[PDB]
Structures are given as C-alpha cells and as structure tokens.
C-alpha cells in the first residue's frame, strides 16, 4: 500500500498546487505567471475565502479555497458533527464534516455560479479544485459536487482532514478514478507527521478518499510515497496531532509568508 517516489512531472504539479493553496492565505501571493486571477469566492459570515482562476496555457479553470484564516473559520474546524451531503443526493448515505458542510452551503451557489461562469466560456478546459486544510476539505466537497456536472474535474488537497465518512470516500474514489494511481484525478497530499489528516477520528465514522501522496523530509519527488488502500500507513501512521510544523509547510512553502 506504499510505493516510494513519483515522476518529476507529477512532483512539479503537486508543488504547483501546493503553492496556489498556500498563497490563498495571502491574496494569491506569487502564483505562477500563466494564471489569471479571477472572481472571488466569499461569505463574510463563515469567512469562507477563495478564487476562481484560469490558466490558458494548461487550459484549466482552477478553484482555490483558503484554509483556516480566522476565529470564524476555526469554529468550522472544531465541529466534527457528521451530516448528510444533502446538496449532492446522488451520493448515497454520504455524510461530511459538519463545520465544513456549514462552510460549503454558505458558498455553494456562489461557487457554482462562478465556476459555470468560466466553464461556459471554456467548455474544454479542465476543472481543478485545490486547497490546504479547511480549504482542502472545502475543495473536496466542491470537487464532489462538480463531479456530477462536469467530467474533467481534478482535486489536489493539502493536509486535508477526513472530510466525510466511508460512503463519501467511495463516491469520491469512483468519481475520481482512485482505483488506480496512474488514473487518479484525486491527489490527497500529506506531509511528515501532519496532524490534520488524522482529524477527525476514523473511530467517529470518518474516512479518507483519494490516493495519498505523502511528502517526507527532505521533500523531493524521490521522497514522496504513493499510499493506497486501507492500512494504517504513511502520514496517518506517524501519530501527528493537531496543527504542527508538518501541517503548515508543504513542499517548503508555509501558509503565512510567501517564501515563493
Ligand atoms: C445533522 C445536521 O445538523 N444537519 C443540518 C442540516 O440539516 C441543515 O440543512 C444545515 C443548515 O444549517 O445545518 C446542519 O448541517
Ligand atoms: C454550531 C454549528 O455551527 N454547528 C453545526 C451545525 O449547525 C450543523 O447542523 C452541523 C452539520 O453540518 O455542523 C455543525 O458544525
Ligand atoms: C479538521 O480539524 C481542525 C483543523 C484545523 C486547521 C488549521 C489550519 O489549517 O490552520 C485546526 C483544528 C482542527 O480541529
């Protein structure tokens, strides 16, 4: 359930999305030069933040969600109450992170309006959803919803908490071709002993979807494992707890400042 090292191509990509995610906490800092900064996703009450972006070179429309950036967002973080994903009925028996569902429904229509706004102009462009931490769970639920409308949807998360229950994980796995890593459209990136991917407890009914990409220090394509299956391994097995050093820094870039 683990293979060490990934292509140099995939590594760059992961580093690329990590960058965009980490920059979402500082007004999309120094994101690649080929991407256009677009419409702002925002709901002052849940303080959900994010942007719809477009890269005409890679031919993809990117949707970024910032991670916890306030006390308001933190209220969302702490709420582990399981709740049905009623916005996507076709996801049989699926239940997601309560606080994150709260954030999700607070922007769903806004998020779907803006996504469609770009997709309607660029039918052939791929749709990528990404984010770090709370922003990562916000991406997963978004990806899932989008999956039922568009076909070319990709998800790249970072330090993503367990966003829902096993049911939710299956839908995601089937929706994003997780059965195989060579075909996966859902990349769940983890780092060292990051504590967030261990929350909330699996015991409480939560579970992870997607194929895991565990970045180990010193980070590099060769120090990145491909974790598949259901056996305690990689990040989930390092015993990381809550928000620690590993969580805030992915591929040498921290959420705050813009080292990049
Ligand atoms: C289990 C639970 O409390 N679910 C409710 C959901 O039914 C409701 O639509 C939403 C709106 O506030 O709040 C919660 O998510
Ligand atoms: C105080 C609060 O916001 N708690 C919410 C609750 O209202 C919601 O019903 C549940 C399901 O998503 O998630 C919790 O986080
Ligand atoms: C999913 O649960 C949690 C997530 C965070 C995330 C913090 C961050 O991104 O800075 C903090 C506490 C939590 O209980």
From Swiss-Prot:
Family: Belongs to the AB hydrolase superfamily. FaeA family.
Record localization: Secreted
Protein known as: Feruloyl esterase A
Binding residue positions for substrate: 77, 80, 247
UniProt cross-references to PANTHER family, sorted A to Z: FUNGAL LIPASE-LIKE DOMAIN-CONTAINING PROTEIN-RELATED, TRIACYLGLYCEROL LIPASE, PUTATIVE (AFU_ORTHOLOGUE AFUA_6G06510)-RELATED
Activity regulation details: Inhibited by the specific serine esterase inhibitor diisopropylfluorophosphate.
Gene transcribed to yield this protein: faeA
Any single Gene Ontology cellular-component annotation: extracellular region
Pfam families in the cross-refs: Lipase_3
InterPro entries tied to this protein: AB_hydrolase_fold, AB_hydrolase_lip/est, Fungal_lipase-type
């Amino acid at each position: 359930a683990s293979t060490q090292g990934i292509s140099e191509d995939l590594y760059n990509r992961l580093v690329e999305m990590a960058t965009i995610s980490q920059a979402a906490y500082a007004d999309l800092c120094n994101i690649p030069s080929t991407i256009i900064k677009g419409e702002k996703i925002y709901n002052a009450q849940t303080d959900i933040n994010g942007w719809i972006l477009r890269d005409d070179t890679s031919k993809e429309i990117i949707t970024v969600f910032r991670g916890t950036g306030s006390d308001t967002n933190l209220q969302l973080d702490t709420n582990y109450t399981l709740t049905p994903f009623d916005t996507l009925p076709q996801c049989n028996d699926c239940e997601v992170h309560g606080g994150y569902y709260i954030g999700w429904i607070s922007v769903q229509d806004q998020v779907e309006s803006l996504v469609k706004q770009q997709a309607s102009q660029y039918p052939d462009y791929a749709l990528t959803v990404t984010g770090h931490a709370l922003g990562a769970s916000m991406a997963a639920l978004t990806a899932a919803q989008l999956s039922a409308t568009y076909d070319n949807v990709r998800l790249y998360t970072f330090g993503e908490p367990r966003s829902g229950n096993q049911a939710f994980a299956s839908y995601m796995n089937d929706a994003f071709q997780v059965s195989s890593p060579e075909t996966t459209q859902y990349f769940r990136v983890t780092h060292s002993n990051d504590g967030i991917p261990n929350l909330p407890p699996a015991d409480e009914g939560y579970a992870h979807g997607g194929v895991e990409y565990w970045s180990v220090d010193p980070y590099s394509a060769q120090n990145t494992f491909v974790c598949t299956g259901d056996e305690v391994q990689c990040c989930e097995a390092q015993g990381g707890q809550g928000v620690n050093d590993a969580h805030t820094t992915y591929f040498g870039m921290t959420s705050g400042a813009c080292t990049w």
